């Protein structure tokens, strides 16, 4: 009988309760993003802009319901319009973390006909962050 740990166990909403995705598993998801007409795009945040916070609600009246901070991350470049090749997306993951070695990276997707964000899942964690447990978190 084990205990799920409360200490340094931050998660990102999709595919975070799974072990970290390999480059073949990230390419398998982009194949799903390209098989229908979705548009992949990368995002990133530092350790202090990654997960959710309340800090702008010091300026509020009672309008705080379903307001959070750090739901936006900074877009990396532009959405890959007309993206057919999943390796072009996978080159940008290496290129983003080279520019930002202390940054989380998530791959989001957008629908073209519905004009909304479809799927969003973490594809990279920094090594310098102690916010997450390496899949043995009991």
């Amino acid at each position: 009988m084990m205990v799920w740990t409360p200490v340094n166990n931050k998660m990102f909403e999709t595919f975070s309760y799974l072990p970290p995705l390999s480059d073949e598993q990230i390419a398998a998801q982009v194949d799903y993003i390209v098989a229908n007409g979705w548009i992949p795009c990368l995002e990133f945040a530092e350790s202090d802009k990654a997960y959710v916070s309340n800090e702008s609600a010091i300026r509020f009246g009672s309008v705080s319901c379903l307001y959070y901070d750090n739901r936006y991350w900074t877009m990396w470049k532009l959405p890959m319009f007309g993206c057919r090749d999943p390796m072009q997306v996978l080159r940008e993951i290496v290129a983003c973390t080279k520019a930002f070695p202390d940054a989380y990276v998530r791959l989001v997707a957008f629908d073209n006909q519905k004009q909304v964000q479809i799927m969003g899942f973490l594809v990279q964690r920094p090594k310098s962050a102690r916010d997450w447990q390496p899949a043995n978190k009991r």
Binding site: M2, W4, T14, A28, Y51, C65, L66, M119
Partner: protein, 427 residues
């Protein structure tokens, strides 16, 4: 009560502003189908007129009466007026033995008069920042008898392990053992604590169903001022006037509105008589609600599976074609009214998860009232075991695997690297 000449007009062409109704209609022995069908319409510019009568195949004494209603019979923005005009008097009529309203058509000139759901599927999903997978839920297991403190402790450990929502029992309102306002604080202490730990947005459907409209708005003011995301409402026992009032308050202050369906099987269970759930689910959407219990699909034959996929499309989609195989008797343009997320009561264990991802896809909440509580390690490993199994089955879908066949081999590939799921794989 018709003379069959004025209320049975088969040569009539329906309007694009007409409200159409489809009644499954069992006559008394000896009453003609046309005279019985015009009597449902009768209950000249304001008459409802039966325009089509079809036999039901396999049933020797059932018929489908299609009745059209002029749009002037109805109040703008009122589900109370819409139900009172259509099903307010006809079921007590003596020349028919049983009557079921099967479907309605709401025309787009009358869809636009309603406020509707406060956020919908697309806006809720943006606000909770959860994408690409189904949402997960859990009812707190003992419905009554907890203290308020021990309620949030059960709420804390469930949201901690990975779930997105926890849920009040629908008969948890305000009782001598746990008053409602003591509950809303220990819930909000448990939501803000499980949120800060996981870094994800968490919620609990705080039951704002109450005895009067003033109690009900007093619970909802309380959830506004704690800043908690979502409340719930029993709408067939609170009624459509209380629901539409709350749903407008939820739009005006950014709260989400889960909608539970207590008392639905008094109305929708029997096949020869009542109001089928797809009418009650269209009417919830017009009244408003962000989530709605749509029921289980696991443990059922694939004739109720196609019907359940029919009223889920009426909840989620914008334009639903006519499809008699799924029980959809009309064409429904929803005219950019937002979708309602169906809440599906998952099975006892995690092995129904490949069934639910294939049936529902992403736009569904999934609830495991005894799936998280019945884990041998507790609530937080049990909540992880569902969350691991949900995301494993979601990934196997995007990779292309058939979850109707390979869904057992995907759960077993995740029993390996995760000890929490393996302890639930072992049961």
């Amino acid at each position: 009560k018709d003379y069959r000449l004025t209320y049975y007009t088969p040569d009539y062409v329906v309007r694009d502003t007409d409200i159409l109704a489809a009644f499954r209609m069992t006559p008394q022995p000896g009453v003609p189908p046309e005279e019985c069908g015009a009597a449902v319409a009768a209950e000249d510019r304001y008459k409802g007129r039966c325009y089509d009568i079809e036999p039901v195949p396999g049933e020797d004494n059932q018929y489908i009466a299609y009745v059209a209603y002029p749009i002037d019979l109805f109040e703008e923005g009122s589900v109370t007026n819409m139900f009172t005009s259509i099903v307010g008097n006809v079921f007590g009529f003596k020349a028919l033995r049983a009557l079921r309203l099967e479907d309605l058509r709401i025309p787009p000139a009358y869809v636009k008069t309603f406020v509707g759901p406060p956020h919908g599927i697309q806006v809720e999903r943006d606000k909770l920042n959860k994408y690409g997978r189904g949402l997960l839920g859990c009812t707190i297991k003992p419905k009554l008898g907890l203290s308020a403190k021990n309620y949030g402790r059960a709420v804390y450990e469930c949201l901690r392990g990975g779930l997105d929502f926890t849920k009040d029992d629908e008969n948890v309102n305000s009782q001598p053992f746990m008053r409602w306002r003591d509950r809303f604080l220990f819930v909000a202490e448990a939501i803000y604590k499980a949120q800060a730990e996981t870094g994800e947005v968490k919620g609990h459907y705080l039951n704002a169903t109450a005895g009067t409209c003033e109690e009900m708005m007093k619970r909802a003011v309380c959830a506004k001022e704690l800043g908690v995301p979502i409340i719930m409402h029993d709408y067939l026992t609170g009624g459509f006037t209380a629901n539409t009032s709350l749903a407008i308050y939820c739009r005006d202050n950014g709260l989400l509105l889960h909608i539970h369906r207590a008392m639905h099987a008094v109305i929708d269970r029997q096949r020869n008589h009542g109001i089928h759930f797809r009418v009650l689910a269209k009417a919830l959407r017009m009244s408003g609600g962000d989530h709605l219990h749509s029921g289980t699909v696991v443990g059922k034959l694939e004739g109720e599976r196609e019907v359940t996929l029919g009223f889920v499309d009426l909840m989620r989609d914008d334009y639903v074609e006519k499809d008699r195989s799924r029980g959809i008797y009309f064409t429904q343009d929803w005219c950019s009214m937002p979708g309602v997320m169906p809440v599906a009561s998952g099975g006892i264990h995690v092995w129904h998860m490949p069934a639910l991802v294939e049936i529902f896809g992403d736009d569904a909440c999934l609830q495991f009232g005894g799936g998280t509580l019945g884990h041998p390690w507790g609530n937080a490993p049990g909540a992880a075991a569902n969350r691991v199994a949900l995301e494993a089955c979601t990934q196997a879908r995007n990779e292309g695997r058939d979850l109707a066949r390979e869904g057992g081999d995907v759960i077993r590939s995740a029993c390996k690297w995760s000890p929490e799921l393996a302890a639930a794989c072992e049961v």
